[PDB]
């Protein structure tokens, strides 16, 4: 069995073919999706996923995340150096001169970290099938230089997984939908993630696969769509009450989640309520927060970010010299694409409606399962 694994930047998923039918497995906690976080508790515990995300605040410097942004790169790089500026954790230079991370004084290679998550997926598949697993396909970004793809390979070894083939994330989504068997189709995978937006135009010359044009952003995904709603709220409060919740950690962390729960609810509803009693207090007594956000306000808040995606959707085709017509198929990947407005704004720039018969956050993981599937 070659459990397929989608080693995401913000979340990872794992699947295995039940016969010919893709079956996305679920972790110990009952999630089909396991955050890509890993923290080394003060007391020496090595948490991974949900639990690790939950103690981040109380432990910023040892709760590693977004390690994919470093996997196969050297301590110098636009990415790496510019991350060193935002990552709450220590990114040091390796002797080899690679980008590494220091946790509690000990220095480890990026792969040594991801393996923690792969470790958890392997155990997750093993917990399903009953028998130990040792084989898998792991997906990478269509732009992954041989260095990363390999370093992404070292991670598996460290996890007891013999990478039987590390295929492309875009290709992954394509195999995930059913673009394998008339004789020639031209696909474009819109990938809006938790933190990254990557667009890929690939050709499945019929059954070959070929990255025709790839473009995307390093800073653009839900987490950024979130900060839009959070802020709207911080500003709104200030207008209606003269207070800066920013100043406040407790209130901010609190408002952050509400905004996040709001943002999701506003995609199956027209308006929701950010209701936070006792949000703060000042000289004039305690303060409560109660705002109304509509699909519309949110949208208005996240516009230039959804359009920024498309403007890139424009240069992706300009480099691939084609019109939305040449594009026979367009698939979406990235829980955030669940937002009506992106679904649309995209359906308009390509004319035809993008297909999503397959779960936006399980897609690429499922693609990876089918490849290693009866195939490998």
């Amino acid at each position: 069995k070659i459990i397929g694994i989608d080693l995401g930047t913000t979340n990872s998923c794992v699947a295995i073919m039940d016969g010919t039918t893709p079956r996305v497995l679920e972790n110990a906690e009952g999630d089909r999706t396991t955050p890509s976080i890993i923290a080394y508790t003060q007391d020496g515990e090595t948490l991974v996923g949900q639990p690790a995300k939950r103690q981040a605040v109380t432990n910023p410097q040892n709760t590693l995340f977004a390690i994919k942004r470093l996997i196969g790169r050297r301590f110098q790089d636009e990415e790496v150096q510019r991350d060193v500026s935002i990552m709450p954790f220590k990114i040091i230079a390796a002797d080899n001169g690679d980008a590494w991370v220091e946790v509690k004084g000990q220095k480890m290679a990026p792969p040594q970290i991801s393996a923690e998550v792969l470790k958890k997926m392997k155990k997750t598949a093993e917990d399903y099938l009953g028998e130990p697993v040792t084989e898998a396909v792991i997906t990478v970004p269509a732009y992954f230089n041989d260095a990363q793809r390999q370093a992404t390979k070292d991670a598996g070894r460290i996890a007891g997984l013999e990478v039987k083939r590390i295929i492309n994330e875009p290709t992954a989504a394509a195999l995930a939908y059913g673009l394998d068997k008339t004789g020639n189709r031209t696909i474009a995978v819109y990938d809006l993630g938790g933190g990254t937006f990557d667009i890929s135009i690939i050709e499945i010359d019929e059954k070959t696969f070929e990255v025709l044009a790839t473009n995307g952003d390093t800073h653009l995904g839900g987490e950024d769509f979130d900060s839009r709603l959070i802020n709207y709220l911080v500003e709104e409060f200030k207008k209606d009450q003269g207070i800066d919740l920013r100043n406040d950690p407790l209130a901010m962390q609190r408002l952050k989640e509400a905004a996040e729960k709001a943002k999701i609810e506003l995609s199956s509803a027209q308006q929701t309520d950010v209701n936070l009693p006792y949000i703060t207090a000042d000289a004039t007594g305690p303060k409560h927060m109660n705002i109304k956000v509509t699909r519309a306000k949110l949208e208005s808040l996240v516009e230039d970010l959804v359009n920024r995606s498309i403007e890139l959707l424009k240069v992706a085709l300009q480099d691939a010299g084609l019109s939305v017509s040449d594009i026979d198929d367009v698939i979406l990947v990235g829980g955030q694409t669940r937002m009506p407005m992106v679904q649309k704004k995209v359906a308009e720039f390509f004319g035809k409606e993008p297909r999503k018969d397959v779960n936006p956050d399980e897609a690429v993981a499922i693609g990876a399962a089918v490849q290693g599937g009866v195939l490998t």
Binding site: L47, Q50, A52, R54, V57, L250, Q253, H288
Partner: protein, 158 residues
């Protein structure tokens, strides 16, 4: 044992195929036997699972109903309160009937399995690292967490 007569090497062939046949069958019948043995292990799990978490989706959609209820006690005619305090009690006590327990106990170390440190607070009311107070109840259904509690962890004196 001479076998140059083609007709002898023919009998010797059929004899071999059949031996192969017998082989395939025996084993080809063992993997499809073991193959279901595995499906029985699962059906049991799938069952014991859907037993534990049948109501999880429902009892998860009510969390925001337990929430507006106590939220209504927070912002808070003496009776109406003892009334809505009794309701919240029957609600909780009822979901607890169906295997749900409420995570809302302070002065215990932070347990990321059912706790969500939402902020560090400089306090000596409890040992550094323990939940100092809870911002919002956390619920568990038969072992799996449906909503970690949003706690406030404590940091040393100053």
């Amino acid at each position: 044992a001479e076998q140059v007569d083609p007709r002898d090497e023919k009998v010797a062939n059929l004899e071999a195929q059949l031996a192969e046949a017998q082989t395939r069958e025996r084993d080809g019948i063992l993997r499809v036997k073991a193959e279901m043995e595995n499906l029985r292990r699962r059906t049991e799990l799938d069952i014991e699972k859907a037993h534990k978490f049948a109501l999880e989706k429902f009892i998860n959609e009510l969390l925001p109903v337990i929430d507006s209820l106590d939220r209504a006690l927070e912002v808070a005619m003496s009776a109406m309160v003892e009334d809505i305090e009794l309701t919240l009690k029957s609600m909780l006590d009822v979901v607890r009937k169906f295997g749900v327990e409420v995570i809302a106990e302070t002065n215990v170390p932070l347990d990321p399995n059912v706790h969500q440190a939402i902020a560090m607070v400089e306090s000596d009311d409890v040992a550094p690292g323990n939940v100092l107070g809870i911002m919002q109840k956390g619920y568990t259904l038969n072992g799996r967490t449906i909503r970690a509690a949003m706690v406030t962890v404590a940091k040393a004196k100053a």
